[PDB]
Design a protein around this nucleic acid. Structure first.
Ligand SMILES: [Mg+2]
Ligand SMILES: [Mg+2]
Ligand SMILES: [Mg+2]
Ligand SMILES: [Mg+2]
Ligand SMILES: [Mg+2]
Ligand SMILES: [Mg+2]
Ligand SMILES: [Mg+2]
Ligand SMILES: [Mg+2]
Ligand SMILES: [Mg+2]
Ligand SMILES: [Mg+2]
Ligand SMILES: [Mg+2]
Ligand SMILES: [Mg+2]
Ligand SMILES: [Mg+2]
Ligand SMILES: [Mg+2]
Ligand SMILES: [Mg+2]
Ligand SMILES: [Mg+2]
Ligand SMILES: [Mg+2]
Ligand SMILES: [Mg+2]
Ligand SMILES: [Mg+2]
Ligand SMILES: [Mg+2]
Ligand SMILES: [Mg+2]
Ligand SMILES: [Mg+2]
Ligand SMILES: [Mg+2]
Ligand SMILES: [Mg+2]
Ligand SMILES: [Mg+2]
Ligand SMILES: [Mg+2]
Ligand SMILES: [Mg+2]
Lengths: 113, 200
RNA sequence: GUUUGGAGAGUUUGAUCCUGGCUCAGGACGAACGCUGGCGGCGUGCUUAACACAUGCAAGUCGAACGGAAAGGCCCUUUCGGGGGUACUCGAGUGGCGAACGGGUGAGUAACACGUGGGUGAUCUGCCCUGCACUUUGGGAUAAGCCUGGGAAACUGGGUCUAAUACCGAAUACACCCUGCUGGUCGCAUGGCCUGGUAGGGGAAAGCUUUUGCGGUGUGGGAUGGGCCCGCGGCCUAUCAGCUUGUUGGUGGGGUGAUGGCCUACCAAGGCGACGACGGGUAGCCGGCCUGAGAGGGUGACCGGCCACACUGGGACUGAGAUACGGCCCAGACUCCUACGGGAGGCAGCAGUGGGGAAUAUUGCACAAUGGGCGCAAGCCUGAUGCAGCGACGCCGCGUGAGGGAUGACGGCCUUCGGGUUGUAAACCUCUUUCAGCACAGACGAAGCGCAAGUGACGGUAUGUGCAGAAGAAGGACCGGCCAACUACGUGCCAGCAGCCGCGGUAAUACGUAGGGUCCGAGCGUUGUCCGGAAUUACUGGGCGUAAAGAGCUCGUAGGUGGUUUGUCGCGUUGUUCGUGAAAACUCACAGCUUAACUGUGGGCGUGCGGGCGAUACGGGCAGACUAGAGUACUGCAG
């Protein structure tokens, strides 16, 4: 069966995962049919991106998600949408963008002067 | 590693001021040792080599790290000599020296290494840390009243502060508006000889 | 269009110029060796014997298929020796699925093995997804159990007995498979399509569960994974010139999922080769890596993709799928057991042992994370994997202190006996404790998992906050010229040095030591290996009068090359667009680790190849024209 898996990238103690469509038999770090997303658990909130157009196609043809990929598809709303259930908007959290560096430079200029 | 041996003998061999406040250099501007007076045969290689030695023993960078700096400078789109100089100028121990909070680049290194500075609110004790545009460098609370740093506050004036740096507060807060262009950088060295040395 | 990119030196001579080889300075490594050695991050580690292998693990799982009841549990019961029931549960066994993946190694292979691009009107595809139809009806066994036999053991026979989603017969299916006839249509010749129409014959199933409920059969489409065929591309060797008779082609059969001498009978006499056939040698191939200005050269460790093999050789079986590493059968070598009749093994899985060698690690800890197998699920399994241990083996980062300190100590070493060096160095005087040390806090990785409410192997690690005190932390090579750095003493062609030229013959900047110096630094040197320098195999980019080099001279075969001009094709060439050129790597940008190494994201790169469309100057093909090249004719002529 063709499945949607996490493949491990990154270095020791820094697991970064790509969301890939691959045959069940293929080894984890093996050739993938498509990369449809990425998942970085070490972040807060863990980084999640999914190409929803491709996720819908692959679930349509019958790709079977793995357990963690199924959790991610529910957060993104791609699972609920594919099935017809509600919640398609999803509950995806995004990291608050840190203050821009230029603005903090202006802040320091004003503060001291 | 670091070079921790005598500092004057290096400036004496190279015939130029590295610390620039050194009385023992001006007293004996000839190279060190028994034969330091004797006539040395000229060669282009010795000239190129000594310009490299002036660079790396001014900033306190080992040859391994300095050669990586060269490759980056040559890779960068500008002219290699300007890129190399401003990369070494971006070093945090150098920025601290240019700001005035230290007496010597050796003193600047020790301070940064011992954990007295913060960059954009995060502690950095890496002397080779390269500052970028709009970096803000601050002093931790414990080291603000620290006796040599107190000296540094009321010893402002030893050297001039370059335009890309700016000390804005009595907290001794350093701002970097940009990386220095070659004109901004003022160093007793001919950079074109080092580019030629590594093209050998 | 276009800058991002090329350094040389020594050595033939009395001297010179040239030619030409040799040698050196650079970079790289799955390294080894010598001296030396503080810490951390991230990688990496049998290159030799595809040598032999002690020991433990590396593949199981399902009571929601089944009879059952050895262990637990619960319920009777007791005398307390045991004996029943239940089926929550579960040993052994039947049955299903998995075991063909994942992991290892590079022996073989010079081949459609691999890379890249196509073809299949010549094909298969379990589980997964999504339409349609269905899931009717009977039957006979057997493992396990119990009794008993044979055998030293491995194992094995007989009787009796039981069940199923195990096995087996029939009906139905008319989507599907086979055959005959026949209509339309699309091409690329076999042919393909219209589930075309029509006649005749034929092809299945299985139940369980009471809960997020799971299943079974045929058939249409999809997705995935393949099979087979072909163009083009990447080693040395004619001191290897002929090779081939299922061999080359055809027809009738056989065989396969499918095409095909794949097999077979007959018939024809072909097929492949100096565009190196057939031999010999070597070698897994590639993305990439190293070097290089580039072109090129070398290389294929790790990581990623294919292939091949699994003690050696041969064979098939089961299955959707098999080089079947931890399956089976046979033969051989080797090890072991035996009652001598006969049996049992296979680390090129992980760890480990012996051996070979200059040389390469622990008989760790977890399934917490990611991937995989089974299960409705809870879960179980997983030496995949995530981590830990060991080796400066590599890369990167940091420390071994900072400021001040004199006409400048002692001591060492030179000397023109004036001193001069070491040297601001040291002593001393203050200043900060990074990394180590001693305390106290203490993770992220888990919008996970179980929803029962507990759950992180790494780990009380990383990282924060306190304390004490410069406190614990520098070596290696070189110093004649290349090539940075010079003197004294000791031996005097000796002992020794050396990459090359060359240094040692009682005054050596070359030997050994010392002082001083230089280059690098937790490393520094040496050896081996590849590229560079080497325009020294020269496509970019060289030569042949005398330096190495014109065949003794012709003729001519293949091949290479081609005057002027008209038209045409659009093969070479050129433009454009689309497809492809996996990821990683590389490169540009940007972000994340305190920085960096490293890691991630988005462009470019991927020079190529295939399809469509455009141009026709030039090369080429095709059809013509012309006479200046070439040849002929005629008239003279010399030898
Ligand atoms: Mg280092
Ligand atoms: Mg091996
Ligand atoms: Mg059981
Ligand atoms: Mg296998
Ligand atoms: Mg059956
Ligand atoms: Mg036939
Ligand atoms: Mg081989
Ligand atoms: Mg070259
Ligand atoms: Mg079969
Ligand atoms: Mg084995
Ligand atoms: Mg097996
Ligand atoms: Mg092993
Ligand atoms: Mg040995
Ligand atoms: Mg899992
Ligand atoms: Mg679950
Ligand atoms: Mg086990
Ligand atoms: Mg010199
Ligand atoms: Mg060459
Ligand atoms: Mg060479
Ligand atoms: Mg020549
Ligand atoms: Mg000629
Ligand atoms: Mg000659
Ligand atoms: Mg001749
Ligand atoms: Mg010809
Ligand atoms: Mg022509
Ligand atoms: Mg021709
Ligand atoms: Mg790629």
């Amino acid at each position: 069966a063709v499945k949607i898996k996490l493949t491990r990238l990154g270095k020791i103690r820094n697991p970064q995962y790509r969301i890939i469509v691959a045959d069940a038999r293929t080894r984890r770090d093996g050739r993938a049919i498509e990369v449809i997303g990425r998942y970085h658990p070490k972040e807060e909130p863990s980084l999640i991106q999914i190409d929803s157009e491709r996720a819908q196609y692959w679930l349509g043809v019958g790709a079977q998600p793995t357990e963690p990929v199924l959790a991610l598809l529910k957060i993104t709303g791609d699972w609920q949408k594919f099935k017809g259930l509600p919640g398609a908007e999803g509950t995806l959290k995004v990291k608050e963008p840190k203050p821009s560096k230029l603005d903090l430079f202006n802040a320091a200029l004003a503060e001291a002067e | 590693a670091r070079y921790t041996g005598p500092a004057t003998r290096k400036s004496r061999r190279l015939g130029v001021d590295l610390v620039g406040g050194d009385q023992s250099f001006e007293k004996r501007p000839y190279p060190p040792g028994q034969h330091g007076r004797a006539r040395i045969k000229e060669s282009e290689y010795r000239q190129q080599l000594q310009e490299k030695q002036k660079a790396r023993f001014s900033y306190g960078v080992m040859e391994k790290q300095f050669r990586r700096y060269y490759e980056e400078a040559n890779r960068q789109p500008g002219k290699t000599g300007d890129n190399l100089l401003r990369i070494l100028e971006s070093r945090l121990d150098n920025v601290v020296y240019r700001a005035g909070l230290a007496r010597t680049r050796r003193m600047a290194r020790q301070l940064v290494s011992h954990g007295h500075f913060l960059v954009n609110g995060v502690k950095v004790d890496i002397p080779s840390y390269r500052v970028s545009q709009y970096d803000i460098i601050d002093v931790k609370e414990k080291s603000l009243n620290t006796l040599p740093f107190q000296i540094a506050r009321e010893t402002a004036g030893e050297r001039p502060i370059p335009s890309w740096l700016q000390v804005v507060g009595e907290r001794q807060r350093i701002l970097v508006h940009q990386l220095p262009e070659r004109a901004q950088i003022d160093v007793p060295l001919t950079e074109q000889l080092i580019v030629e040395l590594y093209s050998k």
